[PDB]
Design an enzyme around this catalytic site. Structure first.
Site, PDB file in Angstrom:
ATOM      1  CB  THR A 189     -51.967 -30.068   5.017  1.00  0.00           C
ATOM      2  OG1 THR A 189     -52.543 -29.497   6.351  1.00  0.00           O
ATOM      3  CG2 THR A 189     -52.779 -31.139   4.592  1.00  0.00           C
ATOM      4  CD  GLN A 190     -45.619 -32.380   3.831  1.00  0.00           C
ATOM      5  OE1 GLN A 190     -45.189 -32.530   2.749  1.00  0.00           O
ATOM      6  NE2 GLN A 190     -45.587 -31.072   4.463  1.00  0.00           N
TER       7      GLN A 190
ATOM      8  N   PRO B 135     -47.113 -26.583   4.274  1.00  0.00           N
ATOM      9  CG  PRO B 135     -47.741 -27.663   2.287  1.00  0.00           C
ATOM     10  CD  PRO B 135     -46.543 -27.886   3.252  1.00  0.00           C
TER      11      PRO B 135
ATOM     12  CG  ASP C 155     -54.570 -26.755   6.174  1.00  0.00           C
ATOM     13  OD1 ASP C 155     -54.295 -27.187   7.378  1.00  0.00           O
ATOM     14  OD2 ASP C 155     -53.714 -27.427   5.235  1.00  0.00           O
TER      15      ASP C 155
END
Ligand code: NA
Lengths: 234, 241, 236, 213, 214, 232, 246, 229, 197
Positions: free
Chosen positions: E1-2, E105, E59
């Protein structure tokens, strides 16, 4: 791709496929090599309807190093091309040209990898690699299908190479070495042991100190045939 | 037959894949494992032949937890059985990842059976020398028990046996009315059947492995506790006399 | 004769002869013994010399601070399978900061060594291990084999003439759990020389010991290191 | 955008005596203008004769320490002996350079004993250039401590001063006073002072307090 | 995930006598928007360990899925070996760092409470693999508000009881509701002790707005 | 016909079995470990006086502190010698130190059973290396001599030989070897034991000798240095 | 798998390759294909084994294949294997042309295919290509050229040669009648028909001829029509009969 | 898989699996193809074992593109691989060149595929000879392609059971500028030599190729040609 | 920054390169040689980015030498030039594009003399004369003025002098000395290096 084990050990510890590759060498045309001080020489055994140039078994690898072979002629051509590639690729990596030991070690290494890698039978050839080093010392090495290599003063491979090496062991004196003419005469005498009626059925080439390879035509060869047979009487 | 029996890529003239049949013989030579579908769940019992008294109890465990809610009971070449449990563990783990809930046992049986079947088609590999029984309980699906063999056939069973005493164990199960009985009762009768079909003369001494899954365990595959196992072992010995 | 050469070929008996042939690599290999108490786990190995001039063969190897092994079979398969254990231990210390459970490590050996028994042009690991180790569940002796089967043990022996050792150990089982360290090592040594003939017995050259427990990490004792343990009882 | 690094700070220091090797650090871990924790010392024990100080981005510090710990075993398994202090410092260069194009943001100072018995310090940059030193400061207060170490340990810009070697008594007191001075003037240095002392007898650890603001 | 979508705000944590306690409001914020006001940002890992998560909820839910399966996979063997609070914290440091080091990340900042072998564990892990232990923890904006108040009490009294720790945590979440814009007045407290992991909720703090008449 | 990774009923790999059988064909070599140094001697087995004697390197420099002698398939050895030479300088690069004699021998021992048909890389091996290696050097644990065979089994040796008269030479080593002897006694012991088994009668061109001491590096003996030792 | 392996790429005990030799026996049954060099040209003349009343004749040839602008070839063996090899020869010719912007020299094109044929004897476990080729061409270095190759990946340069049914009988007949340096294409065309009269069991449907020549700085490859062949057959029959009387 | 040739040379010097594949063709249900001046015919025996078989379902005579068609003798499943592949090869030509594929060029491409299975690893060759009709430059085309991967352009030929009788029958009775009316009638007469039973619209199958491309003839179209026999 | 020039004649090709190996502001070598012997009758003159020139030129050199060893005869200037073009064109849309500008001067026995031109894009152009570098902007118009197709080699050197003297007068970079070589029937011939005060 084909991952079969081609070359393997036998009950009695023989690599049969390498041993059968050496039988393919002993059928091929009798190649002979001789060293000297100033000059290094190679010569080969031999139809009326052929181009001699195309079936030539003496091949230049770089400007300073050439080779002869005996065995399967197709198998020879790949080793020669990959040697030729490695000669220029050596200059590309370290500038300085190839010593005769390095290219022999490479051909040996290539032959050995085919006796041990999967999918591949060995190369059915022995070679006679000759030339002059960086410092200028003359060299003659010999490889075989197993990928062992050794330096020589002179050597034979092919049909009746025992009877040629037996002849070379006796005849290789310091008298035959000193001159360029005398070293060439020694090669022709050795080939005349196996060649049933010599002259026309002998390929022959030479390498000098700084100069490149030079094949002698049948007119130049038959000059040295006269210089041998007259001297036998006296 | 001879000549046609080396590869699972080769039929015989009779229309038989002997490599699969020879893998089933390794199960037939292996020790007896059984399992019965109750009203309120499923129970597993296994004849674990002790090769040496030097080994610990709970070694060579032929009962396995595939999932929290599923139990596997194996018979055959044990190395192959453990790798089949690892296949079934991952396959059950993949279902939870894909769909967010506990895998159905029929589906789990089918997906692992096609894994077992894949090894019966090629020269490049051999069949699993192992039959195993998958067992489970749920709220909605209820009690279910399936068995798979080296060929890759999956059928559902009210009662089932695999190993040395395959036929001998089944005729003892046919006597029991499993459909009405519960898991609390069936542990005694499963322990009884192993002690009957056990050959004391031929084979060495053995340890009875017992596991279960049911309403007693909230549809969770646990081991049978030492209270209940030793009650059932005592019932097996005294009712044999 | 027909079902002897490939691991994939099931025999008509319901057997895979290339596994059973690989088992014989352990048996013709030298003798070694393993056992455990309530607090410790010990390995003892009869180190086979090649000639009497040459130094004795290394039979006990280090895996982790909490696990070590003794070997019997082909040394290359021993070293390959040792490095697999060393690495899976290293992964667990890296990832979890916590030593890998011994039963879990032993399960990964069984999973790994089973793979090539089912695949064509592959072979089983020609080596049997006795695996000493301590964890949250106390000390353990585990056995592994070429067949990919593994066994939790009170004690075990494997190698040349190892039936003699197994008979000794099966008598003194309830003694081992109560023993102190020196008595537990002495028990393992007596099991080992039972494999030998009456002519030859234990010396500091031909014996190696490997010890782990609650107090101690997996230490290996070979030459003058061994001298404390032998000097106690030596007759017959 | 996503930034994979962050500055956690802290100071590290190492001195090499004739018979010893100090390796010390603060215990503050920071991020932004907040303190993460006050008990995060930057000294990590490797062998009985070698210790490493690591400061900068803490994610890389944890990983790189765990890599060195993992590699120490792999060497000992292969070679049947512990790595020498010089061999660790050589190995660390290759690990730091293997991430040349995505750096371990870690200022490393190894300190311990060479094979001849004496003190040996090895200082580093993030991509793995190193050298042996008598002394080196690193991390947040590198700039504050280093020129005082140049002065007092190196005897630089001093004449009519006898060049006497460092006693372990004197060096320990120096390490206390420099980290006191760093704690005052550096925001990222503070809380407490870990000091590891490597002699042939082994490692022993002290913990002097520092400014907690 | 940006780029994270549905973020959760601060996760608190503090050690007490024979246990650890963590707190986290039940809000998934889509930027300024309070979208999901009833979602549990705390997770029961195993009997010994619990996990609260700031940052992106998808996430966290992936990490919940992966951990849950790991604990399931462990409990199949049943061999008297479990992941300690420190072991899960060690794994999770290696997970976030591995994903950080691939420039992909998991956008989370997490607190790991646990009790095992008599000792209390409280462990921080962020998206980059920065990890440590402390007597108290507060992720996100709670680092600037709540962590001051926890360190104030822990200076004066290092060892708290459960009721001292719980009434402190209730006082912290009151301050977060007032001062954090991305918080909400629905939250869960999760304790861990010898007994296991309790997750109490939904709760609320009693507010006071008498300062509006000045 | 069968696979390369096939066990015999005795419990050992046929191709490894047959790789030990290949060393019997190879020419004999001796190494003796002493406190003052490790000597290494080998017969060239020169089939012709035309063949240059100096270009049969059967003892070679692995490093400044290690040598290796070989018997069996000479071509097979050169792959393993180069891999050892690479390993030592890869170790020097990474660690800034010399390898032990054990550590080098182990690295080469890891390559012994790296052969097979299915599941393999492009340049991977079909068969084993039919080569026995006698490593001999001086590391931090004094002077060490190590043997290796096609199986991968490697072990320290006080004295050992390999080749056609390995059986014959090992009996002569048993009687001749003493653990507290000098290096110069151990050098002359080898040439006595080599002269018997050859029966080409031994000379400076017909053999290679080489030694490694603590102080001195790997030294291979010249014509003049061999002619001084020749016979007493 | 190991049981089912033919093992095409191995030395037999004698020191030779069985599948290579056995492929050359397949060629010995196939149609009589020959080639003859001259001063003013090069020719190929082949036995036409596709001979029936109901065959269509789409293409300009049957066994003859053009390769480059300055090159062509004919074959003997399995025709399907020849279609693969000729396609690859054409690919090589253009691959050279793309690279250097000159036509590929004749020896270089032959070595390139012969390196591939040799690979099928040394590795891959594959059966070799059961084709011998006769190549013709012109280049700036050696001019008018004739080459032979075979399944081993071995080639040679010839003044005149033959492959197929009655190979050896045709070569010995060519060794009598060929004069080196003195032969033109008209005299070579007479000798081609003379040799095919010996080997075959002679109508123009059974024969197939082509002539490579250089006219005005550009190479000219053309098959002969059945009017050209039939008049050359009658010239042989008359020249054969004229010698018989005297 | 297996990375070695199953087809190899015997001491005689014959690729034995190809001659064994030709035996599979030679023992197949027979097939005939004839080239008229104005068109091309392809006909074959479709005599299944029972009246239970649905005759409309599966076809022997199949199209490749709108201007080329196909028929076989020998193995049916092997044939269907070549149909699917030939269909792809036609589109791969049409996509690149934007022109209907030449019939010679389609045969050459499918020949290369048929050759592939006489050499490549772990595969037998196809037990099929194909007959390929077409229309390119305002004129008809007929080609054979057999298991070797060799191809021959035919005016007319036969395959399968009694191919020797069909070929000699055709040789004398074929004229080199026949009408397509007559050629369709000849093709059915070639099949009636080798037939065992009374012929019908169902138990044989015929397709044709001309100016307006290739198509399969309907049962009623065949029934008209069967009425005058 | 560097400078090349070629002048084709009736039966020859004159060429010349500068001898500055520059770095930042410093003239590291005054004696540097930018010509590469491909064959006995071919020179490749090469200029561009620092490491790219020699790596590219030498890759070509060795493959031209490999062609000689393999076949027993060297490549023609036409063949060598299109080979040089083929490699530079394939690298153009790839990870490692070589930024090299070059002249390939040669002599064929059949076709006679030939001067080829090539930019880093790999556009090949046969020319009677050409030049590379910023010096080409000054010197190309001098070649337009005084060049004829029938120019003698001794006159062609005096034409070259006017180009090289114009660089000393007007070009801001130093370039004090120049390599000079002729190719014809008898291969490559070294000539006196055109130095200055
Ligand atoms: Na501070």
């Amino acid at each position: 791709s084909y991952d079969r084990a081609i070359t393997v050990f036998s009950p009695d510890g023989h690599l049969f496929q390498v041993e059968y590759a050496q039988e393919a060498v002993k059928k091929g045309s009798t190649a002979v090599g001789v060293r000297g001080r100033d000059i290094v020489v190679l010569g080969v055994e031999k139809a009326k309807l052929q181009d001699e140039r195309t079936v030539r078994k003496i091949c230049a690898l770089d400007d300073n190093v050439c080779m002869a072979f005996a065995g399967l002629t197709a198998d020879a051509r790949i080793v020669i091309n990959r040697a030729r590639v490695e000669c220029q690729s050596h200059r590309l990596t370290v500038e300085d040209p190839v010593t005769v030991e390095y290219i022999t070690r490479y051909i040996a290494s290539l032959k050995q990898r085919y006796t041990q890698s999967n999918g591949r039978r060995p190369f059915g050839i022995s070679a006679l690699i000759v030339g002059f080093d960086f410092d200028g010392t003359p060299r003659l090495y010999q490889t075989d299908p197993s990928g062992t290599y050794h330096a020589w003063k002179a050597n034979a491979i092919g049909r009746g190479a025992k009877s040629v090496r037996e002849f070379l062991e006796k005849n290789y004196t310091d008298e035959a070495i000193e001159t360029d003419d005398l070293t060439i005469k020694l090669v022709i005498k050795a080939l005349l042991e196996v060649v049933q009626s010599g002259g026309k059925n002998i390929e022959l080439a030479v390498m000098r100190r700084d100069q490149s390879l030079k094949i002698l035509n049948p007119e130049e060869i038959e000059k040295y045939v006269a210089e041998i047979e007259k001297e036998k009487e006296e | 037959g001879t000549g046609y029996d080396l590869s699972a890529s080769t039929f015989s003239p009779d229309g038989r894949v002997f490599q699969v049949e020879y893998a089933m013989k390794a199960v037939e030579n292996s020790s007896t494992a059984i399992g019965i579908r109750c009203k309120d769940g499923v129970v597993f019992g296994v004849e674990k032949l002790v090769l040496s008294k030097l080994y610990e109890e709970g070694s060579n465990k032929r009962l396995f937890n595939v999932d929290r809610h599923v139990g596997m009971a194996v018979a055959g070449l044990l190395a192959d059985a453990r790798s089949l449990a690892d296949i079934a563990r991952e396959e059950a783990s993949n279902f939870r990842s894909n769909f967010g809930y506990n895998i159905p046992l029929k589906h789990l049986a089918d997906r692992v059976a096609m894994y077992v079947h894949a090894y019966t088609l090629y020269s490049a590999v051999r069949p699993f020398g192992c039959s195993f029984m998958l067992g489970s309980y749920s709220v909605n699906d209820g009690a279910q028990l399936y068995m798979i063999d080296p060929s890759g056939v999956s059928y559902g069973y009210w009662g089932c046996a695999i190993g040395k005493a395959r036929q001998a164990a089944k005729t003892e199960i046919e006597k029991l009315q499993m459909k009405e009985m519960t898991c609390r009762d069936i542990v005694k009768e499963v322990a009884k059947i192993i002690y009957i079909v056990h050959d004391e003369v031929k084979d060495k001494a053995f340890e009875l492995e017992l596991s279960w899954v049911g309403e007693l365990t909230n549809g969770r595959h646990e081991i049978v506790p030492k209270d209940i196992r030793e009650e059932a072992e005592k019932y097996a010995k005294e009712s044999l006399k | 004769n027909q079902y002897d050469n490939d691991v994939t070929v099931w025999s008509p008996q319901g057997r895979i002869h290339q596994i059973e042939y690989a088992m014989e690599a352990v048996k013709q290999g030298s003798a070694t013994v393993g056992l455990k108490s309530k607090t410790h786990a010990v390995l003892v190995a009869l180190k086979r010399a090649q000639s009497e001039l040459a130094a004795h063969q290394k039979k006990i190897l280090h895996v982790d601070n909490h696990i070590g092994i003794s070997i019997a079979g082909l040394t290359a398969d021993a070293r390959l399978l040792c490095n697999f254990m060393r690495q899976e231990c290293l992964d667990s210390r890296f990832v979890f900061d916590r030593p890998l459970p011994v039963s879990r490590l032993v399960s990964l050996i069984g999973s790994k060594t089973q793979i090539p028994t089912q695949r064509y042009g592959r072979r089983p690991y020609g080596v049997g291990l006795l695996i000493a180790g301590y964890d949250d569940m106390g000390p353990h002796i585990f056995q592994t084999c070429p067949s990919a089967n593994y066994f939790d043990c009170r004690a075990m022996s494997i190698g040349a003439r190892s039936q003699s050792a197994r008979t000794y150990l099966e008598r003194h089982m309830s003694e081992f759990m109560e023993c102190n360290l020196n008595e537990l090592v002495k028990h393992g040594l007596r099991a080992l020389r039972e494999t030998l003939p009456a002519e030859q017995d234990l010396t500091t050259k031909n014996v190696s010991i490997g010890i782990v427990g609650k107090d101690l990490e997996f230490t290996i004792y070979d030459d003058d290191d061994v001298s404390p343990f032998l000097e106690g009882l030596e007759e017959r | 955008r996503f930034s994979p690094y962050v500055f956690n700070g802290g100071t590290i220091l190492a001195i090499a005596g004739e018979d010893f090797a100090i390796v010390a650090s603060d215990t503050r871990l920071s991020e932004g203008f907040s303190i993460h924790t006050r008990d995060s010392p930057k000294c990590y024990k490797l062998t009985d004769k070698t210790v490493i100080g690591c400061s900068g981005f803490h994610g890389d510090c944890l990983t790189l320490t765990k890599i060195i710990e993992a590699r120490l075993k792999m060497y000992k398994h292969s070679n049947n002996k512990a790595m020498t202090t010089g061999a660790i410092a050589a190995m660390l260069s290759t690990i730091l350079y293997s991430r040349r194009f995505f750096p371990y943001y870690v200022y490393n100072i190894i300190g311990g004993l060479d094979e001849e018995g004496k003190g040996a310090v090895y200082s580093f940059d993030p991509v793995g250039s190193y050298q042996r030193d008598s002394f080196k400061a690193g991390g947040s207060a590198s700039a504050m401590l280093q020129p005082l170490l140049d002065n007092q340990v190196g005897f630089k810009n001093m004449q009519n001063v006898e060049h006497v070697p460092l006693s372990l008594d004197r060096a320990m007191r120096l390490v206390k006073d420099v980290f006191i001075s760093a704690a005052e003037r550096d925001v990222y240095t503070g809380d407490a002072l870990r000091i590891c002392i490597v002699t042939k007898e082994g490692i022993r650890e002290e913990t002097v307090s520092l400014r907690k603001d | 995930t940006q780029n994270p979508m549905v973020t959760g705000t601060s996760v608190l944590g503090v050690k007490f006598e024979g246990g650890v306690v963590i707190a986290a409001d039940m809000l998934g914020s889509y930027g300024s928007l309070a979208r999901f006001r009833n979602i549990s940002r705390i997770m029961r890992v195993n009997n010994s360990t619990m996990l609260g998560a700031s940052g992106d909820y998808a996430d966290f839910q992936y990490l919940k899925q992966v951990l849950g399966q790991m604990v399931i996979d462990e409990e199949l063997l049943g061999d008297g070996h479990s992941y300690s609070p420190r072991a899960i914290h060690s794994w999770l440091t290696r997970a976030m760092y591995s994903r950080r080091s691939k420039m992909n990340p998991l956008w989370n900042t997490m607190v790991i409470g646990g009790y095992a072998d008599g000792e209390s564990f409280l462990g921080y892990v962020d998206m980059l693999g920065v990890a440590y232990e402390a007597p108290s923890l507060a992720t996100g904006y709670g680092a600037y508000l709540a962590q001051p108040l926890l360190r104030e009490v822990l200076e004066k009294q290092p060892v708290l009881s459960q009721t001292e720790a719980r009434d402190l945590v209730e006082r912290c979440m009151r301050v977060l509701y007032y001062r954090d814009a991305r918080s909400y007045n629905r939250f869960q407290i999760a304790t861990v002790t010898e007994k296991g992991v309790e997750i109490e909720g939904p709760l609320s703090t009693e507010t006071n707005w008498d300062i509006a008449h000045m | 016909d069968r696979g390369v990774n096939t066990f015999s009923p005795e419990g050992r790999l046929f191709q490894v079995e047959y790789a030990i059988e290949a060393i019997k064909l190879g020419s004999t070599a001796i190494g003796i470990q002493t406190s003052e140094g490790v000597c290494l001697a080998v017969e060239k087995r020169i089939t012709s006086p035309l063949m240059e004697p100096s270009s049969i390197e059967k003892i070679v420099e692995i490093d400044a502190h290690i040598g290796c002698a070989m018997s069996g398939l000479i071509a097979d050895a050169k792959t393993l010698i180069d891999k050892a030479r690479v390993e030592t300088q890869n170790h020097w690069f990474t660690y800034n130190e010399t390898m032990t004699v054990e550590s080098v021998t182990q690295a080469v021992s890891n390559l012994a059973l790296q052969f097979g048909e299915e599941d393999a890389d492009p340049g991977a091996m079909s068969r084993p290396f039919g080569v026995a290696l006698l490593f001999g050097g001086v590391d931090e644990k004094g002077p060490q001599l190590f043997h290796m065979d096609p199986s991968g089994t490697f072990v320290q040796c006080d004295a050992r030989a390999i080749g056609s008269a390995s059986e014959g030479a090992q009996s002569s080593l048993q009687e001749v070897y003493h653990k507290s002897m000098t290096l110069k006694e151990a050098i002359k012991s080898s040439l006595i034991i080599l002269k018997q088994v050859m029966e080409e009668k031994l000379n400076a061109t017909n053999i290679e000798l080489a030694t490694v001491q603590p102080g001195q590096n790997f030294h291979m003996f010249t014509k003049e240095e061999l002619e001084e030792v020749i016979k007493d | 798998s190991r049981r089912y392996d033919s093992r095409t790429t191995i030395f037999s005990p004698e020191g030779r390759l069985y599948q290579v030799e056995y492929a050359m026996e397949a060629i010995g049954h196939a149609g009589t294909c020959l080639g003859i060099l001259a001063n003013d040209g090069v020719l190929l003349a082949a036995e036409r084994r596709n001979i029936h009343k109901l065959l269509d004749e789409v293409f300009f040839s049957e066994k003859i294949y053009k390769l480059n602008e300055d090159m062509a070839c004919s074959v003997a063996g399995i025709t399907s294997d020849a279609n693969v090899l000729t396609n690859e020869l054409r690919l090589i010719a253009q691959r050279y042309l793309l690279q250097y912007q000159e036509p590929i020299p004749c020896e270089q094109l032959v070595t390139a295919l012969c390196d591939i044929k040799q690979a099928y004897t040394q590795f891959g476990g594959k059966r070799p290509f059961g084709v011998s080729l006769l190549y013709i061409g012109w280049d700036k270095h050696y001019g008018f050229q004739l080459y032979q190759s075979d399944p081993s990946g071995n080639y040679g340069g010839w003044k005149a040669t033959c492959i197929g049914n009655n190979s050896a009988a045709a070569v010995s007949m060519l060794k009598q009648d060929y004069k080196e340096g003195e032969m033109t294409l008209k005299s070579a065309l007479a000798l081609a028909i003379k040799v095919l009269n010996k080997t075959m069991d002679l109508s123009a449907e059974k024969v197939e001829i082509a002539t490579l020549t250089r006219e005005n700085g550009k190479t000219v490859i053309r098959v002969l029509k059945q009017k050209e062949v039939e008049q050359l057959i009658k010239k042989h029959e008359e020249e054969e009969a004229k010698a018989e009387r005297e | 898989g297996y990375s070695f040739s199953l087809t190899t040379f015997s001491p005689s010097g014959k690729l034995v699996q190809i001659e064994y594949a030709l035996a599979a063709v030679a023992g197949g249900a027979p097939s005939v193809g004839i080239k008229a001046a104005n068109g091309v015919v392809l006909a074959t025996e479709k005599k299944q074992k029972s009246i239970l078989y649905d005759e409309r379902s599966v076809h022997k005579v199949e199209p490749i593109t709108k201007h080329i068609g196909l028929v076989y003798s020998g193995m049916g499943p092997d044939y269907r691989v070549l149909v699917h592949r030939a269909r792809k090869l036609a589109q791969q030509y049409y996509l690149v060149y934007q022109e209907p594929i030449p019939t010679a060029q389609l045969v050459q491409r499918v020949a290369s595929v048929m050759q592939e299975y006489t050499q490549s690893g772990g595969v037998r060759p196809f037990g099929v000879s194909l007959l390929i009709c077409g229309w390119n430059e305002g004129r008809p085309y007929l080609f054979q392609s057999d298991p070797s991967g060799a191809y021959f352009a035919w005016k007319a030929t036969a395959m399968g059971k009694n191919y020797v009788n069909g070929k000699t029958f055709l040789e004398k009775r074929y004229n080199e500028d026949l009408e397509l009316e007559d050629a369709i009638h000849t093709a059915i007469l070639t099949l009636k030599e080798s037939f065992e039973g009374q012929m019908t619209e169902d138990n044989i199958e015929v397709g044709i190729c001309n100016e307006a491309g290739f198509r399969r003839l309907t049962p009623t179209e065949v029934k008209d040609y069967l009425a005058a026999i | 920054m560097e400078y090349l020039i070629g002048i084709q004649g009736p039966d020859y090709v004159l060429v010349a390169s500068d001898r500055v190996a520059a770095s930042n502001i410093v003239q590291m070598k005054d004696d540097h040689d930018k010509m590469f012997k491909m064959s006995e009758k071919i020179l490749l003159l090469c200029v561009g980015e620092a490491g790219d020139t020699v790596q590219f030129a030498e890759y070509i050199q060795k493959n031209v030498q490999l062609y000689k060893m393999r076949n027993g005869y060297e490549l023609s200037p036409t063949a060598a030039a299109n080979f040089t073009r083929r490699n530079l064109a394939d690298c153009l849309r790839s990870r490692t594009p070589y930024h090299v500008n070059l002249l390939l001067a040669g002599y064929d026995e059949h076709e006679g003399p030939a001067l080829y031109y090539m930019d880093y894009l790999a556009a090949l152009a046969k020319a009677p004369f050409a030049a590379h570098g910023y010096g080409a902007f000054l010197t190309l118009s001098i070649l337009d003025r005084y060049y004829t197709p029938t120019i003698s080699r001794e006159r062609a050197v005096e034409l070259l002098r006017k180009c090289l003297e114009e660089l000393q007068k007007r070009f801001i970079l130093n370039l004090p000395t120049f390599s000079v070589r002729i190719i014809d029937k008898n291969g490559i011939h070294d000539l006196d290096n055109i130095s200055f005060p």
